[PDB]
Symmetry: C3
Subunit: 261 residues, 3 copies
């Protein structure tokens, strides 16, 4: 590994766009954790608290994920394959010019850890049975891991996009459960309004990621590294922080509705 972790860390700092897209989220994730733990202090029902802890875990994983990226621990320099729209790039790391693209794979590694929690909270709010919850979660993880594999794949351009297509198929499974299955389960659960709201927000925001992947450096490359990074951090601010705040706003005011068992 020619490029050191210190060097990548230094490249992030010194790069205004990059460093801000990263450090701003370590900050917002921390404040989110503090606000969430405070908002839910009055919950007592175990099923209501399971929804609150899973929610809270989202920014908890987020602050760790971004610290991994900012430290350089979860960043690597890869060389795109022939034909990849970003093939032939250089990053100027340390003092020399290194071939390749600064790859922030750390985003994928942790999405596989935070998104299931989001899914678990939304399934429970909707009063979902174990089967649909297992189906939503297992495919979500697969969607995130194949995403991480595509980003990590440098041997073949066509391979990169094959991983991507596998990931989309797994994505549609989750989407179908959100829009079709849980939408209906929410009625019987008495949480229709809030679910339909959070459901529409989820579908809209989540669609943003595979769009950014395809337009950013890892895909067709119209967005340079610094910009795809901000595209991902901005989706994160809504998809994770504001979204979790909204779900917890309902829960903390309607404990009785989801209290069941």
């Amino acid at each position: 590994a020619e490029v050191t972790q210190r060097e990548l860390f230094e490249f992030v700092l010194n790069d205004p766009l990059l460093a801000s897209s990263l450090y701003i989220n370590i900050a917002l994730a921390g404040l989110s954790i503090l606000l969430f733990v405070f908002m839910t202090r009055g919950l007592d029902d175990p099923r209501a608290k399971l929804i609150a802890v899973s929610t809270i875990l989202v920014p908890v994983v987020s602050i760790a994920s971004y610290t991994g990226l900012a430290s350089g621990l979860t960043i690597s320099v890869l060389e795109m394959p022939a034909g990849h729209f970003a093939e032939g790039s250089s990053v100027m790391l340390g003092g020399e010019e290194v071939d390749g693209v600064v790859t922030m794979w750390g985003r994928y590694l942790t999405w596989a850890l935070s998104t299931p929690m989001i899914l678990l909270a939304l399934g429970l709010l909707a009063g979902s049975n174990a089967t649909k919850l297992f189906t939503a979660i297992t495919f979500d993880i697969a969607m995130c891991v194949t995403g991480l594999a595509a980003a990590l794949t440098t041997s073949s351009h066509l391979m990169r996009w094959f991983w991507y297509a596998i990931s989309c198929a797994c994505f549609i499974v989750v989407l179908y459960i959100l829009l079709v299955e849980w939408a209906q389960d929410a009625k019987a659960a008495g949480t229709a309004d809030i679910f339909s709201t959070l459901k529409l927000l989820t579908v809209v925001m989540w669609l943003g990621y595979p769009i950014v992947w395809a337009l950013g450096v890892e895909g067709v490359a119209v967005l340079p590294v610094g910009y795809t990074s901000w595209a991902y951090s901005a989706l994160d601010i809504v998809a994770k922080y504001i979204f979790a705040f909204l779900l917890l706003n309902y829960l903390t005011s309607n404990e009785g509705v989801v209290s069941g068992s």
Copy 2:
């Protein structure tokens, strides 16, 4: 060596490329077929079994792609005394010491078997305790096997990892063939387990036997034959076996429901 160089090593070699790309394609077709076959299930418990099984070829088309792209393939120099020691291969167009190691296979098993196990356990009316015990040791088995494959410091260490792993294997096989076959009687599903009993014992024992005999073990099977031995097993386990389980599940939805 480079990822692309490994990717090209697999393409360009009929034995290797076939042992991998064929698994990618059959896994793809099996996901469709499995989703199709089960389009009619209605019971939640049955459906859990069907999705857990469907995940088998999903994990397979993904993990094999990891291998074919070279992402999960690596080159390792075997320890002194190992029967494959002093091997070399030619990758970046040059003599590279070591053996191409498809460590991605352990990922495939560590992720798909927990799913087939969950499916079988539920089918057998297993309680939580035996389901847990089986899945945990099944995973410890798959991972210690991986450890064995990646160990290059000592020849004896690899075999010690193997012993650790085989131990976890009998724990899993025991509940699979013995415990669950017995629980299935009360669940009204004893027959699917006896019909697939020989198929199950042969394919499962098939993996630790291929290890010992292939490049990772005593090496009477070269890298390419080692790849095809594991691949022919996977084809049986991830596709035909899963199909059989699914074929039964669909005909017995009501009873598996309760």
Copy 3:
């Protein structure tokens, strides 16, 4: 480009390192035997589930310690400026090498074994699913963020930030085990054994973050050799004896936990 073969030889020919690692392999091995023996009497599925979660602990340990012993889970890393271990060197093969022999494999031991002992202590206390889900997730986040700290070499300050995140997660777990579960056990019938262990718990669970901060990963008052025995000493207490005291109570009180 140090090899796994050189790391394996480094541990051997290094008395302290070799014994801290090899004594644990041996002790975890017997444990699996002794624990299998002590619990062959069990019949209750709930008592047995608790029994196997606990047996999985020494299994995880003998396997993870073998990873370390084999060199598989060891690496040489260079510490960042200001770090007390920065500027370290180690003899590997036929040349001097910058860095610190990093036993990152230990974090995989804790990440995989602790959720089991937590799933054994929770069920033993009668814990509902919410607490059991909390304690373990934050426990896992703790183990993984600790590794991140150990794996971070770009910034001295970042290591301690990672260590602070890990420590906060650590607080959630200790609050569940010491307080919540302590209460739940009263309605479980198993409040007395939960007490004593809870006491040994505090001391040993705290022992880890204290060692981290004082060993080569922290301010390094303890060299690589001593941090390893420090952790190995703690694992003996938690993975074997603690597991023994737990099983000793279980197998002599299957009626109380039965259900």
